[PDB]
Every structure is written in C-alpha cells, then in structure tokens.
Amino acid sequence: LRTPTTVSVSDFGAKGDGKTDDTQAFVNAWKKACSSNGAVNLLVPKGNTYLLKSIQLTGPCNSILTVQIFGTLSASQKRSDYKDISKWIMFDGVNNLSVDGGDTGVVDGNGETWWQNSCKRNKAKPCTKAPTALTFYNSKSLIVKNLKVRNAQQIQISIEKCSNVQVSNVVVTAPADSPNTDGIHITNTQNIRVSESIIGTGDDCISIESGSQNVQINDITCGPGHGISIGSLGDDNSKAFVSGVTVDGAKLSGTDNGVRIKTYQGGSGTASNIIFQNIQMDNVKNPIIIDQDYCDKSKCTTEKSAVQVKNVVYRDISGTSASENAITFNCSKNYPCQGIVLDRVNIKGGKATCTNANVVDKGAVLPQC
Fold it and tell me: Which windows of the sequence hold PbH1 repeats?
C-alpha cells in the first residue's frame, strides 16, 4: 500500500529498558505524530519495555494516527507520578485513531501494589480510586485491536464518550482476586463493537454504563471475572439510559455472574432493548441476574425511584449453574421488569427466582419461574 510515515519513540530518546523513565520521549513523539498531516504510525518498538508515568495523548490531530504498540508499556508504581489518579494512559479527543498491538504489544499496569493497598483487600485501608490503565475519551471512529492489557491498577480498558468504535482481538488479564479490575468498561459510548476477545480479570469482564447505545459483543471468552454486566445504573440517584445491547456468542467460565443487569434504588431512567444470546455457562454463579435491590449508602431507605428495565431477551443460553439460583429476577416494585423473554434457556444445577418480573417463556426453558 502507501509508503508509511513513522514517528518512533526511539527517535525522541526513549531507552526502552523498563527502568529509565521514557514518558517525555512519548510526549514529544506524540507531538510530532499528532501534528503531522496524513497517515502516521507512532511506533513503540517490539521487544522493549517503556516505563511511563501518567500520560495524556490529546487531540484532535492533523494526522490519521495508527499507534503501533508493539513493545511493552510499564506503569510507574509511584502514586505521585499520576497527574489524574484515575488515569494512567489516556487518549483524549483523538478522532480516526487506531491502536494496533500487532499481537505482541502489552500494556502492563503493574497493579499488584495498588491491589494490596485496596480497601477490598485490606479493610484497615481507606477506599481510593486507582488509575485506569488505558482510557479512550471523546473519540470518534476509533479502532483498538491485537493488543494485550494486563494487571491494570484498577479498570483495565475504559471507552468513555466515544462514538463509532471497533475493538477486536484484545486480551485483558488480571488475577481473579484483584479488586475492581473491570476488563472493558463502556460508558457514554454509542455504536461500538467488541469482538473476538478474551477477558479474565478481577471484576466485570465487560461493564456497560449509562449513556451507552448500540453495543455489540461478539465471540468473547470471559473467566475469571464477574461476567458481562449492564450497570451499575442509577447510582447517586442518577438518571440512567442504556439501549440496544447485543451479546452474541460468549463463553463464561467460573465467573461470579453470567449476564447481569444491576441498578440502584433511587435511580431513574431506563435500560431497554437488551439481548444475550448464544451463551455457554461453565460453572457460573448467577448465570442470569437482574438485581435492582442496590443502594449506595450503608443504610438503605425505601425506594422512591428505580431504573426501568424493559425488553431483555435471553436466547440459546446453555450450561451449568454454580449458584443455588441459576436465574434471578429481583426487580423494582414500583417499576417492574417488563418484556423479559427466555428463549431456549437450559441451565442445570440451579433454580429460578423471579420477583416483579413479567417473563415470557419461548420454547424449552429450564429452569422456569
């Protein structure tokens, strides 16, 4: 094809030994590649390890940028090295961005030291926000592919306020007991497909939050993890909106939940038009769960408002429950779940509990409410 223009971090003094701080080299390389015209590869050379503090790669850019993360990015473990304690690497406002790991690149958050200081893991500790390893924010026409993200400080990959996004052939991994290490976090993002990916992490494999519309999740493996979850929705008495989610082709193994919708008492808004189909459950706790009994304070009041859940289809779901209840519908009394469909569902090893749920059975369904 075209003759490629390449801006390499090598050209800006990045040593690539994993001990020298290469942050400023990345900053300057990003200035060069972002300001250039036309198609530009920003290259992180294969076989090297680049220690990075927090870094913000800000657009919009004159270039059509392909960031070739072929080597390894290694996070500082010093809390003072993070401008925003919630962010390690953040792409901000970059349109027509493609991030390609070439099946060799690794984004390593070095999260263990953050995890042991987490309050979920040491209750003599205060609960603190830890950095998201890789954030894409305010991007249109985004592509993320062929990349591995491991051991994030907290959230591994977050896609926030994005539009027209394709994530394909990524690997996200962290220990099963690592706290709050969401695999792929999707929030206020519309028209996104995540396909052909593998997530085994310490929290939600995929979490879909408010503002999300037209989300496609195809051919993913999840385990360890907390499953594929819409929510949390309506926390802090927020108005939530989620519409048009399809998970089609997934294998969940040993996860704390299978396919989950979770909303908070006091919330408002709606979560609608959701389809979970062609799902294999291998020893999964809470294979199917909608749970609206959540509150964000230590002493919950009687619920005045709830997120309304409507048009949820569970289709061609098969496998084995590790929970007493394979199917759990705990929905709001004042806003009951509506248009819940169970179509060719066969989960053995568990029973079904259904409260304030209008369910419809289509074909062979086991277990039944």
Answer: 162-188, 189-210, 212-232, 242-263, 271-292
The structure tokens listed for 26 are 């990345």
Instruction: Please report the sign of the dihedral spanned by the C-alpha atoms of residue 72, residue 77, residue 81, residue 86.
Output: positive
The residues, any chain, with a CB within 8 Å of residue 332's CB and separated by 6 or more, are 263, 265, 292, 303, 306, 307, 308, 356
Helix (H, G, I), strand (E, B) or coil at 281: strand
**Of 186, 82, 197, 91, whose CA–CA distance to 135 is shortest?**
91
Tell me how many degrees the CA angle 197-201-205 measures, rounded to the nearest 5: 55
Peptide bond between residue 158 and the one before it cis (omega within 30 degrees of 0): no
* 137: CB partners within 8 A, 6+ apart: 90, 91, 92, 93, 158, 160, 161, 162
d(CA 285, CA 52): 38
Resolution value (Å, 1 decimal): 2.0
Q: Report how far residue 69's alpha carbon sits from residue 104's, in angstroms, rounded to the nearest whole number.
A: 8
Q: How far apart are CA 131 and CA 85, in angstroms?
A: 5
H or E stretch including 69? strand 63-69
Amino acid identity, position 43: L
Distance CA 264, CA 271 (A): 12
Tell me which residues are annotated as active site: 203, 226
Sequence letter at residue 129 = K
Structural domains of the chain ordered from first start: 5-366 (2.160.20.10)
Q: How was this structure determined?
A: X-ray
